[PDB]
Design a protein around this ligand. Structure first.
Ligand code: AZT
Ligand code: MG
Lengths: 555, 412
DNA sequence: TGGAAGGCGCCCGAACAGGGACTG
DNA sequence: CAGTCCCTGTTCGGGCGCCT
C-alpha cells in the first residue's frame, strides 16, 4: 500500500495500441553515478517502484546538469511512448509578458520543489513507464522501475501539472481576490498591495496551502530581493528588463551561428528599439547544412554592427497602468522593415517589437503598415486584453485614399498621424477616367509554351507601333512587358489598354515593391508619369486596337 | 431527470480540435462570469487536459442589447454532427415564411439548457477560457446540457418545442413558425400592432413552459433584387463602348442572349479612348435587345436542397456592397445591394460583418440554410476584427478571395 | 558524449490548392 | 471541353531564440 495526495487525471493509449519496448542507451558510468544516487532516493518517497518482469516495456534514460547549478536533472526519452500516447489539449496558451504586469507594492517569486514528482500519475497508466537503470559494469542488471508520478520527458506531464496546479491554487485565490498569482509551470509570481509584513504572512499561508497537497516550497524562493528573476527577466519595483544577452563573437560564421544570432536578436527586440534581422536572415536562404560556413555580406555586417550598438546601452521597460491609455507607435525602417514601441507615458516604453514579414509577391508600404497594425493589435489583445491607440507615419488622406479605393475591405483602429519620417505614401495613382489628349497604347504579348519564345508589343491611335522579340518567357511576362513598353515609349500622360487580367490586377493594387524585376521597372515608370489610365478589354472580341496588336504578337 | 438522446459523429470522423483565440479583457470577464453562474447551475462543468477536444468561445452583444451573450463557435463540431441534424432529426422548411409581411426573430436558446445531453457526447463540447497575459492556464469546461449554437440542439429539443408551440399554432392557425438553431423565426401578414402583440403572447406562452427571451423585425416582402444594368449616355466615347462590351461580354455567361457584334463593330479602328463614337442603327438596336434581356429572369435557375449555398460580396466603394447567392456558377438564386449600413464611410470590416449577417439571415428565411461566404478581405484583417462587430447567434462558413474589379458587373 | 517534453516567437523552403488562359 | 503551365497564396515542418 501507497498513499494518495491529490485527485488523479485519467489517461489512455492510442486505441488498440501498446507500450514502449526499446533498448537502453550505452550510458557512460560517470552519469550513472549521479543517476543511481538520486534514483535510489526516489523509492523511499513513493516516486518510483521496483517491478516484476511481468511488465514488458523498456525505455532509454539520461540526465543533464541543471544550468547554473552543480545539481543534476533526470530526463527519460519517451519519444516512442509519446508517439503512441493519447493526444492532449495543452492548457498553456502562451507566455506572460512583464509589460503586462501591473505595479504591485510587494512581490514574491517561488518555485515548487520537484514539481512533476509531486503529482500522482494515473493508477491504470503507470505500467507503461518501464525503464532500466545502468551499472558500473555490464554484469549487474540494475532495477526496473514504474513511475508513480509525472516523469520529466513525457508528453502528458506539462498539461496535467498545470491543470492540477490550477485546481489547487483555485481555492486560495477565491479567498484572496486581491492577490495576483501568475502561474507558469511550477513558477509562482505573487504580488499584492499589502504591506510587506502582511504580504509575507500571506506568502507563508500559501506555502501551507500548497503543503496540504504535497507541494514543497524551498528557499529557492525570491523573498525581499528585487530584482526578481522571472521568465528570463529582472523585475524591479518600477521597471523591468531582459537578463543580459550575449551575442556570439565568432570570426567565421556557420549557418547555426547565424540562427543563434538572429534568434538572440529577436529575443532582444521585445525591449531594445530598432533591432533589424533582415540581412542576416538573407544569409540563410536555401542552405543545406546547419554546419556549413558562410561569409558575412557588407550588408549583414552593417546590420549586425548597428544592432550591437543598440544592445550596448542598457534599456528597460515599465509596467502597465490600467487607468491610462495604450499607445503603439510605428516607424518604417526600409526594405519592408517596421519597428514599434508600445507605451503609456511618452518615452517610457512598456515594450518594443518588429514586423519584418514579406507577404505577397507584389506589395506596398500601406499594405505592410496594415499588416503591422494587425500583428500589434493581436499582440496587445493577448497582453493587456485591449487594443492600443495607434500613432502612424501615414498621412490621414493617404490612408483615406487607399482604403476607400482598394477593392478589399480594409481597416485600421483608432489612430493619429505622427509626422516622424520617412512617411508612408502611395507612389502613383491610376486615373479613374481616360486622359484627354494622351496617346492611347493598345498592348499585347504572347508566348509559345514549347519555344518559350514570345513577342510583346503595341499599337497606338497616333500610328506609333512596336514589337519586341523575347526569349525564355511566358504569357504573363509578355503581357507585363507590353505594358512596360507602352510606358517607356509614351509621354507623361498615357492611356494603356491591356487585355491581361493578371497584369491589370497586379498594377491596380498600386505596388511599390515586387519580387519581379519586370514589375519593379513597371513601378519605376508608373512613378515617373503624371497621368496613367489603364483599361481592360476582353481578348478575341475584335475590339479596336486590341485585335491589331493581338495579330502583331502571335506572328 | 430526462432521457438523453444518443449522438454520434458522422461515420469515420473525429471531434473538433480548434485553438482558442485571444480575447479582449471585457469578453474574458463576461465569459468568466457567465461560466461561473452556468456552473453553479450545473449546465457546464470543469474538465482537464485528458479531454483532447476544443472549440473556440467568445462573447457578443446582440443588436441594441448591452447584455453579454456567450457564443461558441461550433462550426467544426456541427460539420461533424451533419448526419444527425440533416438526415435524422432535422426540420422542414416553410416556403411561406419569406412571403409574410413581417417576421420576428426570438432567442429561445435558453430552452436548450433544460434538456440534458448524451453523456458520451459531452467530451466533444470542450471549450477553454483564456486568461489576460496568460496569468493562468486555460480554464477548460464541457457541456452537461444542450449547448447554444450546436446544430444537434434545436433538433433534439424539437419534440419539446413542437409541443410547447402546438397550442399557439392552434390558436393562431395561419401564423408561420420556423426554427433555425438558437432562433425562432415567426411571421405574419398581421398589421404591426397585432403582430407585436401576438409575439408577446408567444412569449408568455413560452414562459409557463419555463423559458425566457432576452425582437428583430424583418420584412421579407420588402426584399428586392439587384439586376444588372447598362448605362445611359447621350454621347459615347471609345472607352465607354469598350467598358460596355466588356460588361455585356461578361453578362453573356449569365444571359446567353446577349450580343456584342454590332457594338463591337463601332470599335473597329485603333482609336483614342476619349474620341466620341456615335451609335449605328443596329448597335442602338443590339443595345436595346440587350437592355431587354437583362430585364428577364435567368432561365432554369431553381433551388436544390441537396446543394450548398454560396455567397459572394463585392465592395463597391462609397458605402455600397453588392452580393450574389448561388449554387452553380452563373445560376444566381439572388442578387442584392446594401448601402449605408453601420460603419458606412468609416469602417469596412464592420460593414462587411453587417452584410455577412444580413445575407445569412435572408438565406435562413428563404432556404433555411446558411451560405458559405467568399469574403473580399484578407484573412488576418478579418480574423483580427470580426468578433467585435458580430451581433448574431450563428456563424456561417467563409473563405477569403482576391478578385480585382476589371469590370463593374454588379453595380454601375 | 549524442540523446526528453510542452508552450510562444522569427524565418525559410518545400508541399499542396486553386484561378485563368491556352491547347490537345 | 479536360489537361497542362504559370502564378500566387497558404500551410506546414524544421532550425534557432526564450521559459519551465
Ligand atoms: C527546465 C526543465 C523543466 N521541466 C519541467 C519539469 C519540472 N517538474 N518536475 N519535476 C518542471 C519544473 O522544473 P524546475 O522548476 O526548473 O525544477 P524542479 O524539477 O521543479 O525542482 P527544483 O529545482 O527543486 O525547483 O518543469 C522539464 O520537463 N524539462 C526542463 O529542461
Ligand atoms: Mg521547481
Amino acid at each position: 500500500v501507497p498513499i494518495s495526495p491529490i485527485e488523479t487525471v485519467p489517461v489512455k493509449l492510442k486505441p488498440g495500441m501498446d507500450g514502449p519496448k526499446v533498448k537502453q542507451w550505452p550510458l557512460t558510468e560517470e552519469k550513472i553515478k549521479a543517476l543511481v544516487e538520486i534514483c535510489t532516493e526516489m523509492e523511499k518517497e513513493g516516486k518510483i517502484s521496483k517491478i516484476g518482469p511481468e511488465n514488458p516495456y523498456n525505455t532509454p534514460v539520461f540526465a543533464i546538469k541543471k544550468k547554473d547549478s552543480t545539481k543534476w536533472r533526470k530526463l527519460v526519452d519517451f519519444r516512442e511512448l509519446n508517439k503512441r500516447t493519447q493526444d492532449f489539449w495543452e492548457v498553456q496558451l502562451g507566455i506572460p509578458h512583464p509589460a503586462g504586469l501591473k505595479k504591485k507594492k510587494s512581490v514574491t517569486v517561488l518555485d515548487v520543489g520537484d514539481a512533476y514528482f509531486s503529482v500522482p500519475l494515473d493508477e491504470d497508466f503507470r505500467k507503461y513507464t518501464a525503464f532500466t537503470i545502468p551499472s558500473i559494469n555490464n554484469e549487474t542488471p540494475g532495477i526496473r522501475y514504474q513511475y508513480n508520478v509525472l516523469p520529466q520527458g513525457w508528453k502528458g506531464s506539462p498539461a496535467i501539472f498545470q491543470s492540477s496546479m490550477t485546481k489547487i491554487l483555485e481555492p486560495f485565490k477565491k479567498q484572496n481576490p486581491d492577490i495576483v498569482i501568475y502561474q507558469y509551470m511550477d513558477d509562482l509570481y505573487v504580488g499584492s498591495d499589502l504591506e510587506i509584513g502582511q504580504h509575507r504572512t500571506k506568502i507563508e499561508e500559501l506555502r501551507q496551502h500548497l503543503l496540504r497537497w504535497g507541494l514543497t516550497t524551498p528557499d529557492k524562493k525570491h523573498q525581499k530581493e528585487p530584482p526578481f528573476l522571472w521568465m528570463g527577466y529582472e523585475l524591479h519595483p518600477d521597471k523591468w528588463t531582459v537578463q543580459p544577452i550575449v551575442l556570439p563573437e565568432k570570426d567565421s560564421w556557420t549557418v547555426n551561428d547565424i540562427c543563434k544570432l538572429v534568434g538572440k536578436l529577436n529575443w532582444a527586440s521585445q525591449i531594445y528599439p530598432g533591432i533589424k534581422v533582415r540581412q542576416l536572415s538573407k544569409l540563410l536562404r536555401g542552405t543545406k547544412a546547419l554546419t556549413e560556413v558562410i561569409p558575412l555580406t557588407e550588408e549583414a555586417e552593417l546590420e549586425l554592427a548597428e544592432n550591437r550598438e543598440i544592445l550596448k546601452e542598457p534599456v528597460h521597460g515599465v509596467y502597465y497602468d490600467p487607468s491610462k491609455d495604450l499607445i503603439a507607435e510605428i516607424q518604417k525602417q526600409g526594405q519592408g522593415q517596421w519597428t514599434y514601441q508600445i507605451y503609456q507615458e511618452p518615452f517610457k516604453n512598456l515594450k518594443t517589437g518588429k514586423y519584418a514579414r514579406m507577404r505577397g509577391a507584389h506589395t506596398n508600404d500601406v499594405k505592410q503598415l496594415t499588416e503591422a497594425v494587425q500583428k500589434i493589435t493581436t499582440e496587445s489583445i493577448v497582453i493587456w486584453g485591449k487594443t492600443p491607440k495607434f500613432k502612424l507615419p501615414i498621412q490621414k488622406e493617404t490612408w483615406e485614399t487607399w482604403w476607400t479605393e482598394y477593392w478589399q475591405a480594409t481597416w485600421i483602429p483608432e489612430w493619429e498621424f505622427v509626422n516622424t519620417p520617412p512617411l508612408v505614401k502611395l507612389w502613383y495613382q491610376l486615373e479613374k477616367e481616360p486622359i484627354v489628349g494622351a496617346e492611347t497604347f493598345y498592348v499585347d504579348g504572347a508566348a509559345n509554351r514549347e519555344t518559350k519564345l514570345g513577342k510583346a508589343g503595341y499599337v497606338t491611335n497616333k500610328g506609333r507601333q512596336k514589337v519586341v522579340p523575347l526569349t525564355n518567357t511566358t504569357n504573363q511576362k509578355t503581357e507585363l512587358q507590353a505594358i512596360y513598353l507602352a510606358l517607356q515609349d509614351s509621354g507623361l500622360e498615357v492611356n494603356i489598354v491591356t487585355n491581361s487580367q493578371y497584369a491589370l490586377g497586379i498594377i491596380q493594387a498600386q505596388p511599390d515593391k515586387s519580387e519581379s524585376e519586370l514589375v519593379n521597372q513597371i513601378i519605376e515608370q508608373l512613378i515617373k508619369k503624371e497621368k496613367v489610365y489603364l483599361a481592360w478589354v476582353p481578348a478575341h472580341k475584335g475590339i479596336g486596337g486590341n485585335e491589331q496588336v493581338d495579330k502583331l504578337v502571335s506572328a | 431527470p430526462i432521457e438523453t438522446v444518443p449522438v454520434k459523429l458522422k461515420p469515420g470522423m473525429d471531434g473538433p480540435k480548434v485553438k482558442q483565440w485571444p480575447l479582449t479583457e471585457e469578453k474574458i470577464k463576461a465569459l468568466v462570469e457567465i461560466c461561473t453562474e452556468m456552473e453553479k447551475e450545473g449546465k457546464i462543468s470543469k474538465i482537464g487536459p485528458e479531454n483532447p477536444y476544443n472549440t473556440p468561445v467568445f462573447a457578443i452583444k446582440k443588436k441594441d442589447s448591452t447584455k453579454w451573450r456567450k457564443l461558441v463557435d461550433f462550426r467544426e463540431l456541427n460539420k461533424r454532427t451533419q448526419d444527425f441534424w440533416e438526415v435524422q432529426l432535422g426540420i422542414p422548411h416553410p416556403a411561406g415564411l419569406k412571403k409574410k409581411k413581417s417576421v420576428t426573430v426570438l432567442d429561445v436558446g435558453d430552452a436548450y439548457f433544460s434538456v440534458p445531453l448524451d453523456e458520451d457526447f459531452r467530451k466533444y463540447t470542450a471549450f477553454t477560457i483564456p486568461s489576460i497575459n496568460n496569468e493562468t492556464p486555460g480554464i477548460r469546461y464541457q457541456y452537461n446540457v444542450l449547448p447554444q449554437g450546436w446544430k444537434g440542439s434545436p433538433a433534439i429539443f424539437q419534440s419539446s418545442m413542437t409541443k410547447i408551440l402546438e397550442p399557439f399554432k392552434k390558436q393562431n392557425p395561419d401564423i408561420v413558425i420556423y426554427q433555425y438553431m438558437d432562433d425562432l423565426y415567426v411571421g405574419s401578414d398581421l398589421e404591426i400592432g397585432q403582430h407585436r402583440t401576438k409575439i408577446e403572447e408567444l412569449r408568455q406562452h413560452l414562459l409557463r413552459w419555463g423559458l425566457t427571451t432576452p425582437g428583430y423585425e424583418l420584412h421579407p416582402d420588402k426584399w428586392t433584387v439587384q439586376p444588372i444594368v447598362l448605362p445611359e449616355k447621350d454621347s459615347w466615347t471609345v472607352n465607354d463602348i469598350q467598358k460596355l462590351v466588356g460588361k455585356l461580354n461578361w453578362a453573356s455567361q449569365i444571359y446567353p442572349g446577349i450580343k456584342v457584334r454590332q457594338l463591337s463593330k463601332l470599335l473597329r479602328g485603333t482609336k483614342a479612348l476619349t474620341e466620341v463614337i456615335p451609335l449605328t442603327e443596329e448597335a442602338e438596336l443590339e443595345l436595346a435587345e440587350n437592355r431587354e434581356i437583362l430585364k428577364e429572369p435567368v432561365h432554369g435557375v431553381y433551388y436544390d436542397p441537396s446543394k450548398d449555398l454560396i455567397a459572394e460580396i463585392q465592395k463597391q466603394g462609397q458605402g455600397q456592397w453588392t452580393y450574389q447567392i448561388y449554387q452553380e456558377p452563373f445560376k444566381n438564386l439572388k442578387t442584392g445591394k446594401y448601402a449605408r449600413m453601420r460603419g458606412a464611410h468609416t469602417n469596412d470590416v464592420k460593414q462587411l460583418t453587417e452584410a455577412v449577417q444580413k445575407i445569412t439571415t435572408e438565406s435562413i428565411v428563404i432556404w433555411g440554410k446558411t451560405p458559405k461566404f467568399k469574403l473580399p478581405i484578407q484573412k488576418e484583417t478579418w480574423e483580427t476584427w470580426w468578433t467585435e462587430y458580430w451581433q448574431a447567434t450563428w456563424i456561417p462558413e467563409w473563405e477569403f478571395v482576391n478578385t480585382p474589379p476589371l469590370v463593374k458587373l454588379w453595380y454601375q
